[PDB]
Design a protein around this ligand. Sequence first.
Ligand SMILES: [Fe+3]
Ligand SMILES: [Fe+3]
Ligand SMILES: [Fe+3]
Ligand SMILES: [Fe+3]
Lengths: 307, 307, 307, 307
Amino acid sequence: PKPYVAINMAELKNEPKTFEMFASVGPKVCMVTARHPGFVGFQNHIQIGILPFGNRYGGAKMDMTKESSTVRVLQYTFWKDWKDHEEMHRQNWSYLFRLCYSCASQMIWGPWEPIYEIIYANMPINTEMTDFTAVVGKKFAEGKPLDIPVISQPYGKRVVAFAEHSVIPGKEKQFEDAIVRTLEMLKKAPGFLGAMVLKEIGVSGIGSMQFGAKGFHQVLENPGSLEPDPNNVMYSVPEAKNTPQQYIVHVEWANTDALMFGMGRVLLYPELRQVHDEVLDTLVYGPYIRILNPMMEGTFWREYLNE
Amino acid sequence: PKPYVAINMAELKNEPKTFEMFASVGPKVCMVTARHPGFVGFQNHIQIGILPFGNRYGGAKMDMTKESSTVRVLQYTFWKDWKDHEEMHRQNWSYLFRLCYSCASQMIWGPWEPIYEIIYANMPINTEMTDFTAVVGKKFAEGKPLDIPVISQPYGKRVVAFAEHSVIPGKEKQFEDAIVRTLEMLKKAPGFLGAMVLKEIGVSGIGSMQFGAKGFHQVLENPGSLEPDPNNVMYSVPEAKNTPQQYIVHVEWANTDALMFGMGRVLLYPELRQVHDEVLDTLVYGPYIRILNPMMEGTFWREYLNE
Amino acid sequence: PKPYVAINMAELKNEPKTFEMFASVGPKVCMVTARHPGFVGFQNHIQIGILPFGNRYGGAKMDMTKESSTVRVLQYTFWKDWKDHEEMHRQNWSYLFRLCYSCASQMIWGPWEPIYEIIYANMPINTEMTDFTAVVGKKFAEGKPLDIPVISQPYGKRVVAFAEHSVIPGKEKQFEDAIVRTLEMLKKAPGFLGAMVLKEIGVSGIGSMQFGAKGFHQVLENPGSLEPDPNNVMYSVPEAKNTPQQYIVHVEWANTDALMFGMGRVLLYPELRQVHDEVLDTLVYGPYIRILNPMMEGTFWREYLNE
Amino acid sequence: PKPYVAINMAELKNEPKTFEMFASVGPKVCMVTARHPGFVGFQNHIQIGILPFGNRYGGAKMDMTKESSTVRVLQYTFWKDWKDHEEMHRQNWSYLFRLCYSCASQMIWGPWEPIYEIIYANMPINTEMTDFTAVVGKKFAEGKPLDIPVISQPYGKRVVAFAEHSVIPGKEKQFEDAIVRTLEMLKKAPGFLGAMVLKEIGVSGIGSMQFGAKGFHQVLENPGSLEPDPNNVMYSVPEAKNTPQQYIVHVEWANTDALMFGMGRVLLYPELRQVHDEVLDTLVYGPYIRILNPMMEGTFWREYLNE
Ligand SMILES: [Fe+3]
Ligand SMILES: [Fe+3]
Ligand SMILES: [Fe+3]
Ligand SMILES: [Fe+3]
């Protein structure tokens, strides 16, 4: 079935100590998160650049890692029910807060953790280049050759286009129909590895470290080993859902060239351009497309998605 | 059928002369071993690093080769009957001892050669990336698409997770049942190339150069061309079997990322985490996971394994 | 009386940060350990090298500190009753785990903490070179000139031969008789500062951080300020006792030359070589001799030993 | 059908001007050779090293290109009838000699051109990694999945074991039967890309520039634009056939590791070792194994071979 998605967002100094902490602390957080039986996996990204749209963002390029002074992370966790995410944070707060807080010494902005429902998904299981013979053999033995996926390699060996959109109030249906039609045609592009449309349902205050006054002071005053009061979050997840409605269009690609010209198909192929034009007519904001590297992941979330 | 496994272990100076001796003497030892008709192949590893488990072993990483002052080798030889290994050593002692002993000038610890029975094996034949077309064609021609293996490349082009365990006396059955269930679920991870469970049955005194006093003095006094008395081994293989019972869980992976997150699946996927928890409850020691590179191998041992 | 000995073993990166933690955190652990009235002292070693036995370990030397990428520590604590050690760890777990775990960032292997009984001891009190005048005067005043010891200088000013052995099941009596006879003759060697034989009685799971599944997850997930459940250790000390029986022959020496040729007396002096040959006839493993520097110690453990 | 093989052999200075001539003049020679309708293709090799067989040739390694002062070339041309090769040289002598002679300025030894019959061939068509999808589709559409070959990549993207043998007179039948059995078993090794056995039938005097006195003087005196009398060859091809009988065992491999351990299978796999031992019992000379890079080729000779 379709899981819910929490995306933890933050911006940190681009220096070796940040990446040392990714490698040491990241796994620990993921292991804590996996204590909850509603957890079905994760996909953790670093932003490597921005789609420039020609020279619309002429100061950007798809790989800015050599020049950038900061690194932005977008850590997807997948949940049978979004309330499992909230319950996991509270049941494991002593570990989670202390682990997460240890990153603050590198942080510039964040954490900020919106929650999403998936309204469209065309996402295969991941496979390494070593696996495809066995996959092909198993599918033919089962009489299901149409269920053979593209080879979507895990752990930093593909790229993600992360396209931010917000929609004019009253135009959500037009957006949702037109984007699905767009993505159904987009899948013809070479190197297309999957797409999904994420629709924001709210924001996790506890995952965003957004407390009332008491918890705010405890965060700011914290030596690192005392948790803020997790009951001092003053709003529930749906109370923070944004209007204009926000969407992420998440499309995965074999490489950044396939991404650039593949996403460009909605501009370069006249039949698809007419369909995608109905998306553009609905927007308050966007599309703004971040280029992501999915470095650390628990790929079994796609097994839950695809049953 | 399942062979028995002798694993010769040693630690040597990490320097070019050590690796030159691997290239010159290694093939010779292997050629001598192949004089015995019970020999069914070999798989020789160098340890390249240690799985850090986040920062549990924070001084380790999966590739420590650029920094490490020593190199550990783990030379698997496979035998129709474990007595064939002992018989091979005695029949070829003059060649074998003189070859092995020529390594002493680089040695820091070893050799130490425990013997194992395989209690579980899911290990395919190796193939190069050039072979898979013919393999697929042959398997479809035979009506056996399910026998198409993953592509497990030989000669240093994959990595091994070598997981050391010792088990509380009386918990061997729980360990063995739970670890087999764990590995049957683990094979879903991307880049999984096979796994087997090795259970120690004893130690080869002759292969460990562990003699009585007479042989001990001959070893210490040796100019390099005179063998110790091979009948001066004071214990049979089963007499040295350890209690607590020792096991090796040997899992092969496409690359070190697939290994890290693939082995991490027993911690990150809740359903598999509950099963693997039954393994952890049985342990005196471990799991301690060495990262191995299978550089030199006689891949036909897997042809014997899978018939 | 003879105390019991716990030996905490670990391997860490050989870099200045490691040694700063030894000087900063080491004293704290010892101060916590001294909270228990059964604690009678400690002797903490770093391994400086390996006895090469001619060129049997030709890649090793007695002092490898300038070239080694790792450092091995062997921390002896002395206990009136071995159960005091287990009780001490549990009563003070909050301090001890958080202190010990702070080392993990430098750790490559460990900790591993077997427990031993002393079956033989000829070990003097330590004295500095300034003390011997008063010692001599006091002993002669008491009419006991035979109780005047060698000058065994504390705090890194002598060396230890740490000789590992494991014994064929059924040969423990022959081993113990022969090694005591050997050590009684060995004390004639110049620069001999004492010897003792340690016989393993088990392994401390809590001191080895070997828990069941629950504690394992608490260790891997730990931010550093949360203890694992110390009651989640699944085995008592004797349940982990190894067969083949393991022994340490611990011999102290004025310097590494005295060590090399002194231990060599069991090979070079015919009368002693014949006695020591009876030890060698019993061995599954060894002798393997590590060279240790006893840097940090509570010398009063020898006062308890010698009453 | 099986073509005949001429192998033009030479040794040249290992310097850039030599390789510039290979790229500029080599194609011209091949285009001239292709004037004759009996020409069915070519496979031109440079030797990159020698198989050391452990340390039997301890001064050799598989890739000696960085240190070697010379480069050996082995140019195979394939012919419907070996007499076509002789006819082509004479009909095109003015072009061929002038082209070939232009290389003399780099030459140290050669040219020498023995002629061979193929007594065994298991050689697939070459394919690039881009082709295998269409090949698989075509073979399944034809109902012949067993005819799907391994991927044998052309133009320098595989390696060749060139194994020289000469055989005791009277033992040719034993050699030919045993080597065919050997190669039929060898094809199980990973990365095996094909094998054929070449049996010398003679030497082309004209291709070796071996004339009588008149032609010899014309070669030595040549300004580069005057042909020696091509009728001054004093011996036919069969008159120069060597006794002891000479064979080449030509085995192709995915890479030099697959070659080293793949060819090693005749030494490391007991069942194959017993068979290949019948080969070794017949030898006057060899096996001596050169490592070749098939750089420039007309791959259609395998199409003629396999019909
Ligand atoms: Fe969260
Ligand atoms: Fe062996
Ligand atoms: Fe302890
Ligand atoms: Fe020719």
